Design a protein around this ligand. Sequence first.
Ligand code: CLA
Ligand code: CLA
Ligand code: CLA
Ligand code: CLA
Ligand code: CLA
Ligand SMILES: CC1=C(/C=C/C(C)=C/C=C/C(C)=C/C=C/C=C(C)/C=C/C=C(C)/C=C/C2=C(C)CCCC2(C)C)C(C)(C)CCC1
Ligand SMILES: CC1=C(/C=C/C(C)=C/C=C/C(C)=C/C=C/C=C(C)/C=C/C=C(C)/C=C/C2=C(C)CCCC2(C)C)C(C)(C)CCC1
Ligand SMILES: [Fe+2]
Lengths: 60, 60, 37, 503, 35, 122, 249, 41, 41, 65, 30, 30
Amino acid sequence: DGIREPVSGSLLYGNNIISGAVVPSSNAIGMHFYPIWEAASVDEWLYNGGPYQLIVLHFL
Amino acid sequence: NFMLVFQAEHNILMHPFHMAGVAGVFGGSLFSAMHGSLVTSSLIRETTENESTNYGYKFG
Amino acid sequence: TGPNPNKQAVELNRTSLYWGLLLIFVLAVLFSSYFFN
Amino acid sequence: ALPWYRVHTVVLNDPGRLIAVHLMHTALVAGWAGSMALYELAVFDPSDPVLNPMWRQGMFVMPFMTRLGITDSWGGWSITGESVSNPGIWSFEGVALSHIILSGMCFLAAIWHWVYWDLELFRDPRTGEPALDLPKIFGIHLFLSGLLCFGFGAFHVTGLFGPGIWVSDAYGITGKVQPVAPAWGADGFNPFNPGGIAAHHIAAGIFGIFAGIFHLTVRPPQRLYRALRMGNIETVLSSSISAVFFAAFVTSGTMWYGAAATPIELFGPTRYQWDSGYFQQEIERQVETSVSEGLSESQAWSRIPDKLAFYDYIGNNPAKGGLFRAGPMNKGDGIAEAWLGHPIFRDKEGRELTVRRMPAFFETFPVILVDKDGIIRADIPFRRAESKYSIEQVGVTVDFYGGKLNGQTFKDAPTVKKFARKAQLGEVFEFDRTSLESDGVFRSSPRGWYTYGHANFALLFFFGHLWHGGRTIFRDVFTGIGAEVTEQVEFGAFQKLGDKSTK
Amino acid sequence: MTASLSNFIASLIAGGVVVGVIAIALIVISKSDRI
Amino acid sequence: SVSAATINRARGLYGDRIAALKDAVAAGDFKAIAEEKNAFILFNSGAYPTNKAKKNAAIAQTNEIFKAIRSGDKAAVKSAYDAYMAANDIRPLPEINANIGQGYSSDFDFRVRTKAGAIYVR
Amino acid sequence: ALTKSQINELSYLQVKGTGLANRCAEVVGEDSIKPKPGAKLVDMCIEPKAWAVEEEVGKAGKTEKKFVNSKVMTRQTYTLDAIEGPITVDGGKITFSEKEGIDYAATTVQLPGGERVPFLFTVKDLVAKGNGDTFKPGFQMGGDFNTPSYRTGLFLDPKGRGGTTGYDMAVALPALQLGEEGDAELFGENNKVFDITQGRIEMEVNKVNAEDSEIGGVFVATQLSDTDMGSKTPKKVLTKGIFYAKVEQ
Amino acid sequence: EVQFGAYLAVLLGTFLPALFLVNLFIQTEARKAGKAGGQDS
Amino acid sequence: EVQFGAYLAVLLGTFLPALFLVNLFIQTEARKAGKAGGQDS
Amino acid sequence: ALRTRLGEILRPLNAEYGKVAPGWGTTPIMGIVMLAFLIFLVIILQIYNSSLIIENVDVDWANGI
Amino acid sequence: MEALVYTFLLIGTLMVIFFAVFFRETPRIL
Amino acid sequence: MEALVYTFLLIGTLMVIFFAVFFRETPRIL
Ligand code: CLA
Ligand code: CLA
Ligand code: CLA
Ligand code: CLA
Ligand code: CLA
Ligand SMILES: CC1=C(/C=C/C(C)=C/C=C/C(C)=C/C=C/C=C(C)/C=C/C=C(C)/C=C/C2=C(C)CCCC2(C)C)C(C)(C)CCC1
Ligand SMILES: CC1=C(/C=C/C(C)=C/C=C/C(C)=C/C=C/C=C(C)/C=C/C=C(C)/C=C/C2=C(C)CCCC2(C)C)C(C)(C)CCC1
Ligand SMILES: [Fe+2]
């Protein structure tokens, strides 16, 4: 939601197979093409929902 | 979560373009059960009682 | 006593192993987390 | 040759091995009944029959043992709240042990028939074929079962020879195993009369005797023997499944709705006793007949039995828990210790407020405080900004009556809210959540679980009836259709359907 | 005997009428429509 | 299902419809009682649907009303009608307000346009 | 269980095994004795003929406290014998003032439910008070005695902990201590306190023989169970049985 | 916090049905190898 | 108080070696049945 | 083919096999009994539903005692 | 410690699919 | 709950011994 309340999607942070997910990107990103190299760190790329666009644009 | 939020703002259940494809998924699995049951009913005798009936079809 | 005129061979193909494993492993993906709660 | 799903059809042709296999099956089943009952005796806590009954502990096998008369155990404790010096052979341990003997003896008998399939008894006289005359066998078994049903009703439930049956009162305060005079009128078909159960097995057992005697003599006609295929054993199987899941919709129906066969203090209260407020009306009637005796209020509520207050509680619903909440109810909210008290909520005008209790649907319902005519004087707000009916505004005061919290006002606005949330669900008790690390969240009764499994097993057995109802009728075309069917599949040229004697 | 019972026998009869009206109607045509 | 709110409703619906005949006891309107015979019958079915002993109490308390008006002793009619309200607690709905109120939230409620129908709109 | 006369007519070898040795003697007759300043009671046999332990019971709808009739796990080691104490009269009423004898019987009595309740059946430091003078058909005594702890401080916890002795620590788990907070959650168990509590008994003399100067009656005693050095909460044991004594002059 | 015998119920609910269905496959491969006489018996 | 993965280590340390040794027995019985041509293949 | 003692005691009960009454048998009598059994089940279904009400019979928890 | 059980089963299915594609019983025309 | 595991294994060995005595492969002279 871009409200700085992060949502835990992965298994290693206490999720099931059913409750776990790969989240979508941040609302603050919007439509912006957000690759790895346009983050300042992969810490930040993974905070804002970077790996959604990596999986979706390569799924499609 | 994606389906419920898209029910609220959007009302997909009252959308006939959604009604048409649930008639394509009901009728899809309707006819798959039909065409599967009309073929496997009318099968010609090759096997015995003690063998799977799938061995009455050799490949090719 | 005596040998039966009943007893027979029991078979399972290679594909039927792969169906049968993937049945058990995927039901174990489903009904795992419900058992864990 | 055989696939994994046809793998037991090898025992169809050999009737000596069917008995070998049914004995292995009845050894696993009674082995389970003995070993699960021994497991339950290790789990069971006899210390409190009032606030910790058997259904509260997740006992599935034990209510079936006690409802026909097993009340005592070798550990000296009685389930009826007594103390016995010598229970005898038939206790909870002795019944559970007797099924392990029967498991071992049927196991050995299963091996003996599996080795000796060559019993002459299974041969046709006329031909040499292995053959079972199914209409004579049925007439034997129907005679025995109708005899045993008559003996059960006449000599066990009526208590001439046997100990009786568990017969409780209307509200599950007192019950005891006692004999039952059979009720022969229309009162017998009242399911909540245990006299119907005695009058059932007598009368239904009588017809089970005289229909046995009928089938021991009269042979089937050609018209039934050809159509119903009584030379085929799978026609017994399909028709038996139909009797078995028909019996499961009846038991799982009378489980969930209650009957005299499934009483309250044994399996748990039904769902429909929370809906009508079945115990509320019994609480309030016993209070009104106590204040009409002249008693003041704080000792009018203390005469209510604790076990009756336990039944007017949401965590004692069968419909309260969920699937993958496993285990006893005491892993839901804890062991019950004692009744706290009956809250009465008063406003500044000295009126009376009752928190509207929650239906069994809602996992969460809000806190709403309504008066005698059901108008909201108070609530607990979700949005706390413009709320008109908050408890700190209306000034709702709490006063208890009875229990360990008897006669204690609470004008403290947080604690008024705390007991308003507690009084939304159930009669409020105090629990022990630290014994087994109970969570804070509910469970379901043996009444929930019995009719869960059996209303599902009856569905799967509906399919297995149609499978074997199909496989008997079409025994010949089970391995292909031939080329003879090509002529009879035509719209016309046979004025009947498939019959080569026509045109 | 109640009013709820008098309705029920009235439906057992009328249930047997509807079965009885149909079953006689099947026999009468099938004899006239012999084969 | 019989529930608690179904008891509340027929009590709320028809407890208006019994107590408002206090106007008709006064002049002794003999048709206004006969037009409300079903009001007595259906409060009797709704207020005590599980309780059959208080229901069969309220059968004979209803019969004593109609047995009295058939003779016509206006003194014994009110002598029975007082006992009917004082045993079963007949109560109309009074006026509710902003602090004492909220009779209805849904429009499906049985008290929407009644004088105990109000809502704090905010 | 006959009189003291023909119990004494039996040799030791022919009592040996019969179970006679717990049995208090019996009295025949009703008489008075009128004790003197300087007499005492000498052979105070006290046998409980039924035990009863307080509990929480289930019955019709309500749970409360009562006593179950319960059975003894010790075979025959439960009666008291040869208790003596100087008898006195001060305010017209007779007092017993127990001093010696076998004044404890370490029994254990199993509850219905599997629970074992060990206790000491003691008469230790009794002071009785009669309803009058002159031992009679109905002279009842009653007093308060001391139940000491079942195990004394030399007795040792199965890990080697005691009141007088033993280890003080959980020898089990030597990394429990390690901080400001040591084994303090086990302090309620490492501490082995010798508690002593107070009982109750009520005699009621039924039959009196003064040709042999011997009384006999039926007592009712209530006392407290064992607490394993202050670990478990002890229950209230109620015993009932018959007693017996011989009067001096 | 996670429930307890679910570590047992999953892993014995996988492996005991998984290892069972392996052996109806190992049975045939040996039976078809015993049929056609090769280096294996 | 009892240790935790021992419920796993015993039961998977029984059944996975127990079910393994079953199948070297089921293998031969099928192989000896495929050898001598009977009703089974 | 292994005659036992008990095999000879129960040998008469497996004597007839496919011995069949020659057509139509007692099936009019069976139909009437089966029709009476169905009426009997509709009565039990409707008393228990309380879609049928009998004098002095309620469908409610009573105190057998 | 159940994330072990989750990743063992997910990789468990991914293994079974790998053997099912590349080590399948081939169909023959013969 | 480990007394289940104890009695399952003890009765487990007692079962295996029962099959090992009465269902053994008999030796033949031939
Ligand atoms: C004096 C004689 C006497 C008396 C007092 C009784 C008394 C009784 N009989 Mg009866 N009975 C008698 C003689 C007598 N019987 C005789 C002589 C026979 C012939 C053998 C029978 C055969 C008989 C049967 C077959 C059954 C009873 C049952 C009952 C009990 C009724 C329980 C109830 O209220 O409904 C509960 C029962 C029903 C409502 C039965 C309805 C039938 C089913 C449910 C209809 C639905 C069909 C199918 C299941 C649909 C499935 C799908 C659907 C769920 C979606 C009651 C104790 C029933 C029972 O055991 O209940 C516990 C029962 O099933 N009786
Ligand atoms: C010596 C015989 C015998 C006796 C007296 C008992 C006694 C007991 N068993 Mg039991 N049992 C036995 C043999 C026996 N068992 C065998 C041989 C097996 C293996 C199949 C079992 C398997 C078994 C299990 C699995 C369980 C018991 C249970 C019980 C207890 C409760 C009984 C109960 O509620 O039954 C209720 C039984 C019924 C309601 C069945 C009614 C019969 C059906 C509905 C009849 C319908 C078909 C019939 C043919 C209709 C046509 C006839 C008609 C015309 C008259 C009871 C203590 C239960 C228990 O608590 O465990 C200790 C339990 O869970 N037993
Ligand atoms: C009709 C069947 C039946 C019923 C209703 C009950 C009822 C009950 N049993 Mg019981 N039990 C039964 C048969 C039954 N038992 C059998 C056959 C066994 C031997 C295996 C046991 C062994 C047993 C034990 C050991 C315990 C109980 C307990 C309980 C109580 C708690 C319910 C619970 O935990 O559910 C749990 C429900 C579920 C987990 C729901 C599962 C949903 C379905 C079945 C999914 C199946 C599909 C899926 C493919 C499964 C494969 C797994 C996958 C990974 C491959 C309850 C009274 C407990 C208790 O407190 O009693 C003292 C307890 O500790 N039972
Ligand atoms: C009284 C019940 C009953 C009985 C005796 C039979 C008997 C039979 N069925 Mg059958 N069936 C039944 C109910 C029953 N069925 C029901 C209810 C269904 C619907 C689900 C079916 C569906 C069915 C099909 C679809 C087929 C049969 C077949 C067969 C035949 C061989 C079965 C076999 O080898 O299984 C082999 C099974 C296994 C090796 C293991 C299966 C694994 C299961 C899923 C889990 C194991 C269950 C578990 C251990 C505990 C069970 C608990 C219990 C309460 C159910 C045999 C005559 C076959 C047949 O007729 O041959 C052509 C066949 O094709 N049945
Ligand atoms: C979808 C439902 C369905 C289907 C397709 C079948 C199919 C079949 N059943 Mg069947 N059966 C069913 C449900 C069904 N069953 C139920 C629920 C029961 C339990 C009552 C049975 C009991 C049963 C037996 C006992 C036998 C069969 C047999 C058969 C087979 C032969 C055909 C036959 O005579 O049918 C059965 C006929 C019907 C299902 C007709 C039903 C029409 C009834 C009379 C309507 C009555 C109206 C109702 C009473 C109104 C009042 C109720 C109201 C108050 C609610 C066939 C495979 C036989 C078999 O396997 O042959 C080898 C056999 O022996 N069935
Ligand atoms: C040999 C012998 C013996 C012994 C015996 C024994 C020891 C037995 C046991 C037995 C037993 C011990 C048995 C039991 C078993 C069990 C079972 C049989 C189980 C079952 C299961 C199943 C069936 C499944 C279930 C389920 C699940 C798990 C899930 C959910 C669903 C269900 C429910 C389905 C004796 C000594 C006597 C004698 C001599 C001989
Ligand atoms: C020998 C023989 C034989 C065989 C037999 C058989 C084949 C058997 C089978 C058997 C079977 C087939 C059995 C089964 C069983 C099962 C089981 C026994 C199971 C159960 C389970 C359990 C017990 C578990 C539990 C649990 C836990 C622990 C935890 C979690 C939860 C649960 C519940 C899961 C024959 C006949 C040929 C002949 C004669 C000889
Ligand atoms: Fe096709």
